[PDB]
Amino acid sequence: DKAPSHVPFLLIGGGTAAFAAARSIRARDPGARVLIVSEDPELPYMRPPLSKELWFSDDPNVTKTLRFKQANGKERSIYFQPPSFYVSAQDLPHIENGGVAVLTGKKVVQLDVRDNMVKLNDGSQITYEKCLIATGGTPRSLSAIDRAGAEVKSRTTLFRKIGDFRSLEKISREVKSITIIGGGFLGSELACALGRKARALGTEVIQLFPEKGNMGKILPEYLSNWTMEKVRREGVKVMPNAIVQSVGVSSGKLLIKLKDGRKVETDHIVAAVGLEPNVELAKTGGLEIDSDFGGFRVNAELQARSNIWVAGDAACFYDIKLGRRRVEHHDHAVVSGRLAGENMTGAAKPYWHQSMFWSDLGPDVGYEAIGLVDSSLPTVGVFAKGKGVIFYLRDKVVVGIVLWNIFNRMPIARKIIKDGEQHEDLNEVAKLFNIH
Amino acid sequence: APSHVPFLLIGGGTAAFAAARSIRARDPGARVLIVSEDPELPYMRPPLSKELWFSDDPNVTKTLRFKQANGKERSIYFQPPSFYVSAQDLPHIENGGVAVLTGKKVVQLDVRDNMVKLNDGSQITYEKCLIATGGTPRSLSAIDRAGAEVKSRTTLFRKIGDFRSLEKISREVKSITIIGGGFLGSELACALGRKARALGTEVIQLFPEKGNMGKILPEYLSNWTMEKVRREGVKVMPNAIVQSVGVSSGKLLIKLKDGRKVETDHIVAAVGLEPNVELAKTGGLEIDSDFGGFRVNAELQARSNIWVAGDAACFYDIKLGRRRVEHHDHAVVSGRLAGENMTGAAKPYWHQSMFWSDLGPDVGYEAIGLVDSSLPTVGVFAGKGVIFYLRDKVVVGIVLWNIFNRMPIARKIIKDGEQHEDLNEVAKLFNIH
Ligand SMILES: Cc1cc2nc3c(=O)[nH]c(=O)nc-3n(C[C@H](O)[C@H](O)[C@H](O)COP(=O)(O)OP(=O)(O)OC[C@H]3O[C@@H](n4cnc5c(N)ncnc54)[C@H](O)[C@@H]3O)c2cc1C
Ligand SMILES: Cc1cc2nc3c(=O)[nH]c(=O)nc-3n(C[C@H](O)[C@H](O)[C@H](O)COP(=O)(O)OP(=O)(O)OC[C@H]3O[C@@H](n4cnc5c(N)ncnc54)[C@H](O)[C@@H]3O)c2cc1C
Ligand SMILES: Nc1ccnc2ccc(F)cc12
Ligand SMILES: [Cl-]
């Protein structure tokens, strides 16, 4: 498709934050003409299903349909909207009452803030009246894998996109051993997914990471340790306290050497070791980057310059209640994207409604969280019967909450963090989550 | 006070006035309200440490008028009172105007409701707001830990009242000690030194650095400046760190960490500035933990309808990085820029501001950009000279020593960002051969 020379609303990146902004812009300006520029070839879609529901689908064609049943039981697509919801970029300036167009397979490579203009990888130039940067991030790699050969790189997956789910799902049906490097939520979710698939095929799934347990940087040690046992019981060989020294090929198999004496033989590697914000457009744009948290530095309204906002994983924003942060959650991309779209239509609203996070580690372990969640903060945990709540404290105030197997109570956790009261007994607060 | 005003400027100093003029020039019917905690109308401060001390008129303390370098006499006030309109008539007068509400302090900022609250309970809503609160002079821990008599005999020099009180003190006591080697402390030393020569009194200046402006100028130039300050009738004591200050038989006794002790009658502390950021709490506005002040972007904007300018603004310089500048011309430039952006300009800080200092009649300094003695420097001299401050193989700051009317040249060198193969050739641009 050809890109129009001018568009009122330009959204750079075609992910969750961009789509939520497009929906928000259209809801507030019913005749709005919104162009999304996406380097990926796919229309906007949500990523959480790529490590969860799509692996537990009953439909054996799930790799083709990309449909899944939600907790409510209703089936849906990973795509936020079907193609019929969008208009073509060529017809965008002509269609009555405007619409939302997605220019796929195109990357914005230059940003001219003074002239309100971008340049694409094919030389096309597009002027805008208001611009959203929603470029997300790029998965990090391991130094050991960067130093390894080309064969190792070709057998290492950085799990982010639909193509990664399709390649890894097919690999899980062809090889006998897959090793996941990374103890975060993504690595743990993939371990449970591959663990379930391995039980039916009789294959091997290994997860190794330097922490003492899964999500060691997020959950307290005792809860991190308990989570590791549940991941192990999903058919996963979990190796905590594991630092990769090198990776090589030995008789067709990948050989992982750890800083200790242990060695791991496997057929394929999946690296889930964090994200790097896509901030390359800051150079040509003269946009400030945050050296502490990374990403584009924006204010409480997600604004960088007069006609430029940033949302999603790439936005380092000022939280008037919690301080300067950068969040990499799905619901944050939705909330921050929606907020940006509103401010692109004159709302002038600060980030106020805190976004939630969630993770499913099998069918028996569900986590929900909100606010500042970091195992380095002091914590108070209250548990009962299997379930519990963990409060993260700062300045004698709750700044983060993790709900373990407690659902439909995120608004309560959100209000506790908003009120910012110095509680004399967190066990009484725990009763708000039906913990007695 | 009006209940509502389109343009509200918090603080009545250089940045506020420049913003009001800028707003009025772009929106000729604009109605601008300045809220100033001081009782005085907007005025420039540089004369308070220079021209007003070298005036021939013995009534200068009353007139607050001085002769410029051009020789034309003027007031420290930016405009006469007749230039302003009253706050009562501001919402009614044809074609609007600029009003100043003196003796009133904004004590609360409600960003959500576009509303401020004054110290007298008055509430004022706005459509666009400029925070130009400047800063407050810092004090010394040694003087804060001292008694009330020490505090009462220590001057923090910033306002008209400080000039009047210090001028009177210089005619009543025999020894004044300035603590601080910066531009303010050195200018006051030369001023009191000239005034002391006619009375035969004493002026002492002590600071921790090896010389005047040790944090700004390279060591060799800082030392040379110290000798010139001494020749103005000043006893300069470098490498001096105050350990404590007390009163001994009616005299102030300053005890230094190195064992030295100084007897004096009055102290002037010129040891830096603290940005007035108290409104950030109620306003939910971010402060910069590195440089201090309100954190704003390249357009000096904090929130949708709030800008910050002057000494209190920590802004992003797209060419030089995040900074906070405390110069007179920066308050003028940033204030003007804010006013333009408050009327839809959407312009980033681009025109670099200059600063200057006069240390007597024989030493004039002008500088621009990032000027810091910790940066690598190259000095080219001929009585006069230029000092280049380098970073990433590029000139990021320039100091001109006794070279005038060439700041646009220095400004262009920093803008071009060229990697010069020979800075001696560049010095020829400043008539240094
Ligand atoms: C497998 C997986 C599972 C997840 N599961 C969960 C979960 O269970 N719960 C949760 O809370 N979060 C989860 N997350 C995190 C959540 O998906 C992210 O926070 C969210 O996708 C971030 O949205 P975004 O719009 O900021 O960026 P992205 O979704 O990454 O979208 C950015 C898009 O812009 C493109 N782009 C980048 N630069 C340019 C450019 N210059 N020009 C054009 N296009 C460009 C990128 O290619 C990408 O297509 C998961 C993430 C992954 C990868
Ligand atoms: C004695 C002296 C000599 C100087 N000489 C030079 C020189 O030679 N060259 C140079 O480049 N620079 C010089 N400077 C620095 C220059 O004067 C300052 O950079 C300039 O005044 C900054 O302007 P401003 O608007 O940011 O703040 P200010 O001029 O300080 O104005 C702020 C005003 O706002 C008021 N205010 C604060 N908070 C509130 C509130 N909540 N409500 C209402 N009002 C409030 C403050 O009382 C003050 O009146 C000198 C400064 C001083 C003090
Ligand atoms: N000459 C000066 C006197 C007092 N304060 C100053 C602050 C900044 C500056 F650049 C110059 C000053
Ligand atoms: Cl000291």
Numbering used by the authors:
A (entry chain B): 126 to 510, 561 to 611
B (entry chain A): 128 to 509, 561 to 611
From the paper:
To understand how SAXS CX1 and CX2 chemotypes engage AIF and enable dimerization, we crystallized select fragment hits with the W196A dimer-permissive mutant and wild-type AIF. Crystal structures of the W196A mutant bound to CX1 fragments and the underlying 4-aminoquinoline (4AQ) scaffold revealed that these scaffolds localize to the NADH active site, mirroring the native NADH ligand, as do CX1 and CX2 scaffolds bound to the wild-type protein. In all four W196A structures, the CX1 quinoline core aromatically pairs with the AIF FAD cofactor, positioning the primary amine to hydrogen bond with the E314 side-chain carboxylate and the W483 backbone carbonyl. To accommodate this amine interaction, the aromatic side chain of F482 must rotate out of the binding site. Halogen substitutions at positions 7 and 8 (fragments C12, D1 and D3) optimally accelerate dimerization. In addition to hydrogen bonding between the primary amine and AIF active site, the structure of top-ranked fragment C12 additionally reveals a unique halogen-π contact, which places electronegative fluorine compactly against the F482 and H454 aromatic rings, reinforcing their pairing. Although fluorine attraction reverses and rotates the aminoquinoline scaffold, the primary amine still hydrogen bonds with the active site. The dimer-permissive W196A mutant also allosterically releases H454 into the active site, absent NADH ligand binding. This points to H454 release as a preconfiguring event that allows CX1 fragments to engage the AIF active site and stabilize the dimer. When the AIF(W196A) mutant is co-incubated with CX1 fragments, the oxidized mutant fully dimerizes and remains dimeric throughout the time series, similar to the wild-type AIF–NADH–DMSO control.
